[PDB]
Design a protein around this ligand. Sequence first.
Ligand code: HEM
Length: 152
Amino acid sequence: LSEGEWQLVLHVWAKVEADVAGHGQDILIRLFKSHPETLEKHDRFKHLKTEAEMKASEDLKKAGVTVLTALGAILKKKGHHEAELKPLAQSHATKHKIPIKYLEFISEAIIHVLHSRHPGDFGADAQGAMNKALELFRKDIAAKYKELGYQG
Ligand code: HEM
């Protein structure tokens, strides 16, 4: 990414940072409604059925913050994220077993929610820059997954 692309990424991300939990809820609900098989990975809250139930769930709201806190720290490294990716790849490859396809689904949900909430900060410029940043994340985590023996 260019420096200007990174800045577009971080500018919209500052919006997310004003209310991380609410953004996390909207992203995870989007992911689970669009790709329900992904919900199966979350043993604590895989029984949830309705949008209202998902919004009321403390565990889901915690999970959304967990994701976005880690992702935000990754984005802020502007591609220099090997040290932050290392523990994430370790758990997601060997413990949780999250295939790349699911990381594509959550990337799609992130993009969907940013476009829905912050369209003035998410025009084609910013969309394209966030797409690149999330693609780079997936490329690099996929290489780490393979290093660890997981072809997911
Ligand atoms: C942007 C992508 C993601 C980030 C940054 C992220 C980050 C995190 C972090 C920081 C944790 C806690 C520490 C750890 O266990 O590594 C975690 C746990 C977990 N993640 Fe992710 N994650 C991502 C995507 C996904 C997806 C798409 C799924 C499932 C479809 C998933 C499933 C899980 C599960 C099952 C746990 C264990 C939670 C528990 O049972 O307490 N993650 N993730």
